[PDB]
Write a sequence for this structure.
């Protein structure tokens, strides 16, 4: 029974951590994309 | 001069559009993967 419980714990922890990390990476990538969209610097030609 | 400044801004935009296209492709891939995962999980539930 301890082995069954430990296997369940290991599987759930591994899969949940992996998916959480993947989703956090996707979210930060999306935030970076939004920043770049707002961070466009082509307006510097106003100096010329 | 303003000519060079705005010209460089246009060039940088040429890169930025490609970067955003890459981000869109990544998002498409992620959504496809999650769709496949949920779709196969629903079938595993029916098997159980």
């Amino acid at each position: 029974r301890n082995l069954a419980a430990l296997e369940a714990k290991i599987s759930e922890a591994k899969t949940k951590k992996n998916m959480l990390q993947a989703r956090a990476k996707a979210a930060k990538a999306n935030a970076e994309l939004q920043q770049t969209l707002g961070g466009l610097g082509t307006s510097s030609a106003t100096s010329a | 001069d303003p000519e060079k400044v705005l010209e460089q801004a246009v060039i940088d935009m040429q890169e930025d559009l490609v970067q955003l296209r890459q981000a869109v492709a990544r998002t498409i891939a992620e959504e496809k993967r999650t769709e496949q995962r949920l779709n196969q999980d629903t079938q595993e539930a029916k098997k159980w």
